[PDB]
Design a protein around this nucleic acid. Structure first.
Ligand SMILES: [Mg+2]
Ligand SMILES: [Zn+2]
Ligand SMILES: [Zn+2]
Lengths: 98, 49, 1335, 91, 71
DNA sequence: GGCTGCTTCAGTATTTATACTCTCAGTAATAGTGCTGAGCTCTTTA
DNA sequence: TAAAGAGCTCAGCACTATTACTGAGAGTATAAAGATACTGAAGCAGCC
């Protein structure tokens, strides 16, 4: 089973799971470490944002690759913002200083 | 009738007949467990039992 | 983009400041239009456009009409994206007490009013009242009332006296509480108290008060009056995202919550009987409760089907909250998964890959290439072309792969090699081949495993993979410089079958002149393979200055030896190969090859090796059949005699002649005997049956049983496996752990009978369940481990220090385990080294210690070497290189910026997957010596030492210790100190069957205060006869004289107390319960018999509890400070004692559970840290009583030994760095010229640099003591809460940081992942250097 | 059936009795017990019908979305959401 | 025949800088009009970069000062 | 008056059965609605 | 004879008033209807 790109969950735009759905593989914290053991930085970054959630970012990527330009725009995760607002739910005001 | 239909069509002591072998078809009846209502839990599992 | 994240609280003002409106209507949808309601939980009127740029006005179509709000809709005009995030709010009707700040455990509010929790509780649900400024009556601002009390008082005090119930009064109190005055009050009281418990509660409270009054936080804010409501699009009506559909039950609570609110108002709007208004207030409070964190009350509101539903907190915690579910682990695009196969034709740097997955994984690339080529014109054209595989496509794809890497991984990712890179070759198949070497790293069988595969996109990413995760880059296990490319099992059988010799084969012993001829004479079938033969060869060496000078000779070897030898690359001498070449041989060959040659020779070598091994194994025909299992003919013999005897001993017992326990023991031992005997029988018979003439009679060399061939090869299978196959597999366990009386008499050749088989069944089921649980616990273990370091990065080079620890080989008392060669190998030394001959420096000062240096040392009986170590580094935020040394996988000083913590943690956590759950007869020859000595001479005129600290040590003839042994008090030495020793004798021995309580001079003894009945007893000795007026336990003797306990005044013939030799005070000690001097009154004893006589886990959880700084059970009390020992108050519950220095005040006055067995008598002056009692080591105390390197070395040795017990290997630097983290907070003990308090704690390195600044000025900063916290402790007390929140227990740490109002500077990894930037790990380290340098 | 509902049910009934106490003759209907009894009874049935058809509405919205991503749909479940969403609608 | 960065690190004894400079060079040649300094035989752009690195003529110093004379 | 042992709790690893009666209420769909034009209607006399 | 007026009324987009119609509300007066395991931490509890 493969997945170039397909749907995404909606509450969080992470590519859906399972094989019935055109789901992407499970990429885990253990792997996260196994990657940090190497100085495998860009790998991990473009892994967990540009191919997972950075919607603006992933669109820009898809374009640049399908038009001959391997280059990444970092952006900033989305489901993270979900957590941000989720803690904004309770009165614990959270903020992102300058 | 509501409760009966529920029980049959819905109870963790009921599953599709494992049906791909005259063997498995018979293994899936001479089988006994202690799960569900009146039994321990898959992660409540005590070593002894 | 943006710097540090900050947390704080929010006045309901700011809640208003957020929301784009306020929601009141409890419902959502029209069920006909399916549109939002007019003013409801989803309504556009606040949240916004359900489409983009137009709403139910239909009034605004293009960018000309965007933006400006409608009047029919009322809603602004924009894209629906913003609806996802806009927040709302409810206005509360009655105030609400927040639950988190109520059940912090301990409550950060009850203490804020110093209140017992249950009272604030009963205030909430209104089971009682509460007095707010009781006024001109005897009732107090913190008093509460039973209802009737309130009723009655309020009768006679229906005045300005105030008593209510509910968050009303709490918002009152909090709002009506100033702090600064309160603070100073606490200052005073604290400064005044002598009770420590009060001191602790008060210091915590004053701490929290300084926390609040420190920044702009206002306590009443913990009472809710404005409820913020989540953006609508995150709790959608139904996810509907395929599959079964979820319910997003949040709204429901919300719904019911909002419901009650209006009801409240409505009922207040009716002037309702206040009892029931109370009820509705209660309903509201419980509702908002259940919204915030269900379950913290009595009955968690089950959703349905008997399931609890999900609050705002459940989205957060567990292995399914945002953190452990989608912030860290995340399914990713451009990935695939399949089954695996071998494909041995592949070389090292490449992997097979099916056509299909290959096609999808690169669709964008293919599109780009086609449209660059013009073969298609639009994207749709390309989609169609790719659909039905217009046969051009393939070559297109071919070009795309040309060197495009891929990344492979397995499911349970243990360590740094579980995920690697490859360069695929395209297969018209469906499965994945695999270079059959790497399969070890993947711990992977080929029985249905499933591998996963991902693809780098950016050129930078391809580069990262290329240089850093390619199989051509990962050959030395990061756990230990072992080559990790071990040719596993069948190449092994091949090679072994090749390098070997038959007694007489075809054309054996002829002469040849080139391995070419060897090959030919083999294939031509004119010469056998394993046959002795003289052959001319040559060989090389770059022993000279790089130049691999070659040189010939003639050897006598076997053919295949040479055949292989044609492959061995340049710089190798032949004798490396002349052996028979089992497995570890090829291992060490690989290693030395890598060490002397570099890298590419090694990989080419290994590849060729696999090729040749597979080929020759193939040629071999190494089958196996019913005749591979030889049988001990005398099996039945040993068994028949064993059972004959056991029948006898059993009928002996059954006749009543012995005890059942020892009879069982005898049965155990006899079955063990027969077991080992038949083992010897078989194994020997098998291993040698070569009997074949050599033109003469015969000779007997290593036989050729395929089974035996494997075993001696060590390719696969345990000798015990054979043992089971042929020999009877002895006895098995018991559900308990007992053992069945009769053993398994049978083998597997013959068949088991029912019962034996049954028993084996039980044992196997046991082992399997243990496998399950073991994997389980190892999981959470490695979790904590990786989590505890998570941030340690090589920040520098050389911390500028010449300390460290003096490492030495380990001696378990008997044999030594690690030669000094190892602890040193690759660990930069601070000081240089001397020779045993004085002034003979050997190594330079601070040099890196590679292998030729290990040689130069090892030849010189090097003793013990100081070396840099991580615990000792002189740097903040990381560790200097030389304190760390070599990369353990790259034979050079580790570069600058790796994440050492994570590699250490993975290494350590991996092997848990498989882990489990007197006399001195020296044997060697040399010199005897001792340490911590105090001895005595007898009429025997020999040495008998008089301490429990004496340390025997056997020094060899070289200069390096071979043995040492702790030998207890009262042990007679046949020899002395400074003699010769041999094997087979004991030099000293004692009696552990008593307690030596000797005094060491000849004189007179007494029954001084030893009056029977009160503290001692009369003993008409029924064993000998001597009327030993024997001592019992005074505390179990009479209750009046149990204080005047039996002293033993050592006196002479003069009767005067003989002042101890040299000393001016004699030995006036005690004979406690059952401490007997059988020798009578006034007897003149000579030294040589004790005065008083008193005849006297480890698996993985051991490591687990160890790292958690867990509890020793019955710790052994050490010496806080020197001095002598005294006895005062007694049985204030327990025994007591006091200790006095030689110069300072007696500071130590401690009680003891009377059970304890002392270690040193009163009069002795001991040194600090001497173990004044018996038992284990109390790690915290080990630290504060022993410094650092003590406890470090300790832990190191324990874990290393628990591993050693299982053959596994881990370099110590990992354990080093783990401990290095383990202590990071120090407790100040004198504020000094610094500012902080005295009884608190601060980050060690932070206060350290604080001193570095301070102590640049004569004003001496704060004195302190480094501390010890277990991993689970230090995981929390970090500069970061986000990383903490990633760890367990979100709730308390989170509300805590919020109350505090912290701010996180993002200095670390587990946080630079969340924001998703370049972690300062590899490349990212460089960029972070840069980005800091900018500002 | 359900504790959570039952809470709101009783809430309803209580308010209903509260307001409805306003008018209770004595000369006739010599008992207030049954008065409040049937009052709350009706309040309850009102609440429950509201909630039933609410979640019904939820079902209805659901069944009108089968066009999610690709092929391989399901037949078993959908019929049951349908059949309930019909049964409830019968009323 | 570019499989090992062994000598790529013999120049830059860093094994990390490698990625950086190779990435700059690749971004240059792939999209930007920077021509290989080394005879190319259908080897991908990053492989070209690594080639140019492993011959002692491209580094931080040389490529940066090329960019400087460019400015 | 400060002082140690028990202790209790808290943190880890599909799909819910029985009103009634107005009574109103104001709403959203919905036919009534009237244009524009335009296209055919019609005659004109050149 | 046939190009060219001036009007007779029929497609084709609204509009206001409408009409089921669904919702909100207000009346309701028989009853008594349960098989982890562990570690830890403050609070409670008895003591010289
Ligand atoms: Mg497997
Ligand atoms: Zn509108
Ligand atoms: Zn250092």
């Amino acid at each position: 089973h493969a997945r170039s790109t397909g749907s995404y969950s909606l509450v969080t735009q992470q590519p859906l799971g399972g094989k019935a759905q055109f789901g992407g593989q499970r990429f885990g914290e253990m792997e996260v470490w196994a990657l940090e053991a190497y100085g495998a930085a860009y790998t991990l970054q473009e892994m967990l944002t540009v191919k997972s959630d950075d919607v603006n970012g992933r669109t820009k990527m898809y374009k640049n690759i399908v038009d001959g330009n391997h280059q990444m725009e970092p952006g900033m995760p989305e489901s993270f913002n979900v957590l941000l607002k989720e803690i904004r739910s309770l009165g614990i005001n959270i903020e992102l200083e300058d | 009738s509501a409760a009966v239909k529920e029980f049959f069509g819905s109870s963790q002591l009921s599953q599709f007949m494992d049906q791909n072998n005259p063997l498995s078809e018979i293994t899936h009846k001479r089988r006994i467990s202690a799960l569900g209502p009146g039994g321990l839990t898959r992660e409540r599992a005590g070593f002894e039992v | 983009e943006f710097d540090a994240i900050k947390i704080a609280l929010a006045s309901p003002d700011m809640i208003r400041s957020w929301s784009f409106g306020e929601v009141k209507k409890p419902e959502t949808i029209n069920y006909r239009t399916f549109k939002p309601e007019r003013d409801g939980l989803f309504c556009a009127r606040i949240f916004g456009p359900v489409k983009d740029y137009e709403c139910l006005c239909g009034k605004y179509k293009r960018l000309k009409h965007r933006g400006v709000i409608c009047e029919k809709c009322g809603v602004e005009v924009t894209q629906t994206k913003v609806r996802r995030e806009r927040m709302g709010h409810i206005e509360l009707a009655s105030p609400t007490a927040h639950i988190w700040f109520l059940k912090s455990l301990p409550s950060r509010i009850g203490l804020l009013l110093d209140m017992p929790l249950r009272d604030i509780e009963r205030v909430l649900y209104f089971e009682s009242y509460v007095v707010i400024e009781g006024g001109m009556t005897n009732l107090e601002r913190q008093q509460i009332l039973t209802e009737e009390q309130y009723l009655d008082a309020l009768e006679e005090f229906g005045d300005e006296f105030d008593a209510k119930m509910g968050a009303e009064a709490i918002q009152a109190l909090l709002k009506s509480m100033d702090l600064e005055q309160e603070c100073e009050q606490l200052r005073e009281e604290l400064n005044e108290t002598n009770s420590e418990t009060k001191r602790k509660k008060l210091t915590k409270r004053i701490k929290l008060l300084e926390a609040f009054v420190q920044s702009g936080n206002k306590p009443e804010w913990m009472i809710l009056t404005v409820l913020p409501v989540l953006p609508p699009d995150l709790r959608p009506l139904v996810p509907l995202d395929g599959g079964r559909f979820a319910t997003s039950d949040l709204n429901d609570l919300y719904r019911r919550v909002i419901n009650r609110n209006n009801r409240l108002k409505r009922l207040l709007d009716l002037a309702a009987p206040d009892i029931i208004v109370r009820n509705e207030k209660r309903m509201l409070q419980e509702a908002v409760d259940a919204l915030l964190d269900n379950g913290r009350r009595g009955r968690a509101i089950t959703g349905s089907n008997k399931r609890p539903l999900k609050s705002l907190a459940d989205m957060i915690k567990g292995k399914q909250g945002r953190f452990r579910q989608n912030l860290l682990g995340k399914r990713v695009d451009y990935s695939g998964r399949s089954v695996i196969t071998v494909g041995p034709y592949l070389r090292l740097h490449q992997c097979g890959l099916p056509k299909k997955m290959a096609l999808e994984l690169f669709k964008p690339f293919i599109y780009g290439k086609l449209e660059l080529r013009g073969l298609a014109t639009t994207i749709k054209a390309a989609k169609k072309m790719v659909e039905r595989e217009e046969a051009v496509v393939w070559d297109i794809l071919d070009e795309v792969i040309r060197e495009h890497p891929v990344l492979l991984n397995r499911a349970p990712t243990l360590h740094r090699l579980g995920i690697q890179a490859f360069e695929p070759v395209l297969i018209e198949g469906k499965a994945i081949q695999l270079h059959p070497l790497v399969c070890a790293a993947y711990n992977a069988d080929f029985d249905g495993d499933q591998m996963a595969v991902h693809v780098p996109l950016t050129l930078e990413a391809q580069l990262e993979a290329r240089a850093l995760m390619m199989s051509t880059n990962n050959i030395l296990s990061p756990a230990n410089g072992e080559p990790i490319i071990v040719p596993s099992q069948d190449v092994v059988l091949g090679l072994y079958y090749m390098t070997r010799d038959c007694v007489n084969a075809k054309g054996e012993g002829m002469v040849l002149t080139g391995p070419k001829e060897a090959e030919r004479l083999y294939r031509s079938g004119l010469a056998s393979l394993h046959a002795r033969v003289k052959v001319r060869i040559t060989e090389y060496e770059k022993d000279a200055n790089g130049e691999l000078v070659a040189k010939t000779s003639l050897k006598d070897t076997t053919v295949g030896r040479a055949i292989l030898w044609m492959i061995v690359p340049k710089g190798l001498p032949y004798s490396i190969v002349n052996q028979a070449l089992g497995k570890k041989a090829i291992s060490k060959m690989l290693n030395t090859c890598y060490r002397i040659l570099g890298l590419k020779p090694t990989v080419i070598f290994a590849d060729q090796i696999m090729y040749t091994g597979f080929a020759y194994a193939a040629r071999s025909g190494a089958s196996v059949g019913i005749d591979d299992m030889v049988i001990p003919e005398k099996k039945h013999e040993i068994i028949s005699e064993a059972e004959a005897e056991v029948a006898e001993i059993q009928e002996q017992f059954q006749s009543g002649l012995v005890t059942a326990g020892e009879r069982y023991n005898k049965v155990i031992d006899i079955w063990a005997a027969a077991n080992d005997r038949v083992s010897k029988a078989m194994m020997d018979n098998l291993q040698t049956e070569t009997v074949i003439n050599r033109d003469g009679q015969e000779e007997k060399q290593v036989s050729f049983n395929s089974i035996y061939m494997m075993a001696d090869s060590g390719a696969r299978g345990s000798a015990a496996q054979i043992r089971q196959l042929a020999g009877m597999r002895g006895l098995m366990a018991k559900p308990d752990g007992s053992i069945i009386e009769t053993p398994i008499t049978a083998n597997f050749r013959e068949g088991l009978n029912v019962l034996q088989y049954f028993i084996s069944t039980h044992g196997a089921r046991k082992g399997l369940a243990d496998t399950a649980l073991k994997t389980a616990n190892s999981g959470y273990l490695t979790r904590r481990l990786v989590d505890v370091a998570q941030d340690l990065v090589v920040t520098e080079d050389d911390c500028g220090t010449h300390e460290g620890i003096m490492m030495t080989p380990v001696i378990e008392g008997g044999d030594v385990k690690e030669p000094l060669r190892d602890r040193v190998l690759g660990r930069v030394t601070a000081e240089d080294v001397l020779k045993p001959g004085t002034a003979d420096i050997l190594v330079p000062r601070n040099t890196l210690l590679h292998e030729q240096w290990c040689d130069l040392l090892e030849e010189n009986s090097v003793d013990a070497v100081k070396v840099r170590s991580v615990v000792s580094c002189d740097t903040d935020f990381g560790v200097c290189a030389h304190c760390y040394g070599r990369d353990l996988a790259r034979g050079h000083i580790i570069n600058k910026g790796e994440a050492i913590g994570v590699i250490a943690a993975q290494s350590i956590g991996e092997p848990g997957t498989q882990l489990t759950m007197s006399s001195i007869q020296v044997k060697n020859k040399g010199s005897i010596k001792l340490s911590n000595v105090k001895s005595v001479v007898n009429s025997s005129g020999k040495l008998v030492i008089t301490s429990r600290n004496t340390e025997l040590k056997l020094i060899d003839e070289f200069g390096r210790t071979k043995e040492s042994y702790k030998v207890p008090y009262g042990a007679v030495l046949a020899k002395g100190d400074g003699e010769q020793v041999a094997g087979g004798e004991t030099v000293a021995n004692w009696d552990p069957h008593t307690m030596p309580v000797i005094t060491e001079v000849s004189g007179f003894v007494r029954f001084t205060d030893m009056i029977d009945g009160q503290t001692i007893t009369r003993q008409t000795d029924e064993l000998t006869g001597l009327s030993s007026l024997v001592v019992l336990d005074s505390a179990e003797r009479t209750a009046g004289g149990k204080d005047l306990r039996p002293a033993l005044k050592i006196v002479d013939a003069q009767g005067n107390d003989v002042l101890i030799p040299g000393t001016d005070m004699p030995a006036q000690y005690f004979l406690p319960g059952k401490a007997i001097v059988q020798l009578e009154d006034g007897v003149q004893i000579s030294s040589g018999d004790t005065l008083a006589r008193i005849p006297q886990t480890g698996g993985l959880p051991r490591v687990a509890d160890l790292f958690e700084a867990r509890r020793p059970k019955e710790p052994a009390i050490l010496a806080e400070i020197s001095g002598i020992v005294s006895f005062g108050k007694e049985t204030k519950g327990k025994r007591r004692l006091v200790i006095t220095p030689v110069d300072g005040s007696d500071p130590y006055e401690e009680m003891i559970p009377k059970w304890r067995q002392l270690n040193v008598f009163e009069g002795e002056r001991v040194e600090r840290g001497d173990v004044i009692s018996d038992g284990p080591e109390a790690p915290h105390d080990i630290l504060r009583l022993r410094g650092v390197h003590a406890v470090t070395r300790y832990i190191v040795n324990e874990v290393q030994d628990v591993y050693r017990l299982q053959g596994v290997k881990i370099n110590d630097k990992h354990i080093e760095v783990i401990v290095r983290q383990m202590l990071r907070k120090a407790t100040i003990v004198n504020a000094g010229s610094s500012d902080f308090l005295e009884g608190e704690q601060v980050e060690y390195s932070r206060v350290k640099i604080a001193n570095r600044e301070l102590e640049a000025n004569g004003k001496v900063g704060a004195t302190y003591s480094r501390d010890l916290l277990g991993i689970t402790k230090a995981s929390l007390a970090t500069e970061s809460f986000i990383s903490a929140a990633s760890f367990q227990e979100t709730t308390r740490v989170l509300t805590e940081a919020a109350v505090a109002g912290k701010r996180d500077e993002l200095r670390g990894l587990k946080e630079n992942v969340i924001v998703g930037r370049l972690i300062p790990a590899g490349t990212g380290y460089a960029y972070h250097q840069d980005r800091m340098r900018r500002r | 059936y359900t504790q959570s509902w039952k809470q709101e049910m009783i809430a309803d009934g209580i308010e209903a009795s509260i307001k409805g106490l306003h008018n209770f003759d004595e000369t006739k209907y010599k008992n207030p017990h049954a008065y409040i009894t049937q009052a709350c009874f009706n309040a309850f049935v009102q609440r429950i019908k509201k909630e039933r058809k609410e979640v019904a509405k939820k079902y209805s919205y659901f069944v009108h979305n089968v066009y999610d991503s690709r092929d391989d749909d399901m037949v078993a479940l959908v019929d049951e959401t349908f059949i309930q969403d019909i049964y409830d609608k019968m009323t | 025949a570019r499989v090992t960065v062994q000598d790529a690190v013999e120049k830059i004894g860093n094994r990390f800088d490698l990625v950086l400079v190779a990435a700059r060079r690749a971004r240059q040649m792939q999209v930007g009009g920077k021509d290989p300094l080394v005879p190319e035989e259908n080897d991908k752009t990053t492989v070209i970069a690594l080639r140019e690195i492993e011959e002692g003529l491209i580094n931080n110093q040389i490529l940066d000062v090329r960019e400087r004379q460019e400015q």
